[PDB]
Symmetry: C3
Subunit: 203 residues, 3 copies
């Protein structure tokens, strides 16, 4: 389940090397690229040192089990550097900015923005037309299914570097000031600020 | 123009496949790598499956319009994982650390450091010899061109996980305490701290 | 050790590595020793320094029909950590410099950033987008919350780094300032800025953090 996927560019007398079905070998007679588990590929490189004379190994993760979300057909905008796990629901015309991180089970509603370097923890739920500020953290609640995650209702603005703690609901149309730590449910149409966040105005 | 670029490693009887001008195909008879739009390349893979035996598709962005900054000739240091949009000015001898993010229109002065996981929003301006702390956020003001962005003057230290709000100027030589939220202009050569940030020293 | 870190950093030359996919009449091109060329007659890829490869592309323009240049860093001297043999879990997007110790069964989450000299103990979790500064030390069975920042120090070598002792929980978006020790079993509330040592088995909160329990 945990994997250490590598891509390996190779060159040499490749016709002399046979590759197992466990690895995807894209090669011609002298040069090629190999895709597979490092444990499998390492053995191949070692046992064929005579014919594979040079190689470059690329690797981006170690003992990782959860794949990344396939972005190619999503009806929304995902910028370079955003890391999104599989099993995340991205609503129509949402925007996921550079270097944001979104964990499994998260939901991002239609038209919502997750700004740069923001973090959505497991199952965090963001409604429609929300703005989750840069560096803001929505706590995760990976399991059980019955455990209330962070829920941000529609039309909410969450300030930069905010933290919303596990199981907290931010009510519709509310505003959370930058830097706040939200420890309790926020009533709809109110502005909260501080650590712990307190209501400072009714909208 | 929103794009969905892909890089596709491919193999098969590749001479039998004709690639359009829209696709850059670096291939030989047996194997190759294709660069282009997903819409374009998906069509090619499906229609030529008779000749394509296997492939691997890589993709890092979806419906993305703004390209990344070409770093190759910049007289500065940019570390792996830093994400910098095009139309950003990076001063001589600046340093951009791993996992920082710098949005369009930002300006970083000579000798300044943007630390790990810091965020410079749209049009945010940083002077010379500044240090923007890890995780600090300089709010963005993307438009209109007449809206004042965040302006950090020279010789400033911004603490880790600070937020400087839209349109605020942090004056020359000031220090902002870690975790502060700067909600109004900071006078030159003062220390501010707290949320909201208040003058201390 | 700290002296070794400083010496390593300065023995490393600044690099601008590229990967360049090329095609054309490549048999007419002689690639220099300084470049790794994985090529066939028709097409291939080149690994090397931009300054070296740019020269090649120019001087052989008549033989190179097209190319794509990839680059992810500029004037960068410290390489990334080889993850392939580490007995831990490191997720995509995590950026870890060489000369970092990752303890058995640790977890480094997506988009975390770990500077040179850092030490992460066994079974500890560094959560999403957290930052470990130079020489920052995290004990065993710790949890460093998402977005939390542990201060760094590289120079001088004698300077005290941030030390997180065992069994600690650091809340999300917390900042621990340089030289601070967070005591064994302590809990730091989300959003706190820790400005002085935290006694073991206490709870601290606020900015500046103060003992609450
Ligand atoms: Ca290797
Ligand atoms: Ca990243
Ligand atoms: Ca989580
Ligand atoms: Ca912005």
């Amino acid at each position: 389940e945990k994997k250490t996927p590598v891509k390996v560019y190779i060159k040499g007398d490749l016709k002399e090397v046979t590759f197992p079905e466990t690895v995807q070998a894209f090669v011609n007679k002298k040069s090629g690229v190999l895709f597979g588990e490092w444990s499998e590929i390492k053995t191949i490189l070692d046992e064929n040192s005579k014919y594979i004379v040079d190689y470059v190994v690329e690797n981006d993760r170690r003992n990782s089990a959860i794949p990344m979300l396939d972005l190619k057909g999503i009806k929304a905008r995902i910028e370079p550097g955003a890391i999104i796990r599989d099993h995340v629901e991205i609503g129509d015309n949402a925007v996921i900015m550079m270097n944001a991180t979104i964990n499994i089970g998260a939901v991002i509603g239609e038209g919502s923005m997750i700004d740069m370097n923001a973090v959505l923890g497991g199952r965090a739920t963001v409604g429609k037309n929300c703005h989750v500020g840069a560096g803001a953290v929505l706590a995760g609640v990976i399991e059980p299914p019955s455990a209330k995650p962070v829920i941000v209702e529609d039309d909410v603005v969450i300030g930069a570097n905010v933290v919303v703690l596990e199981g907290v609901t931010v009510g519709k149309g509310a505003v959370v000031a930058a830097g706040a730590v939200v420890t309790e449910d926020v009533p709809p149409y109110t502005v909260v600020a501080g650590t712990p966040a307190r209501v400072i105005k009714e909208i």
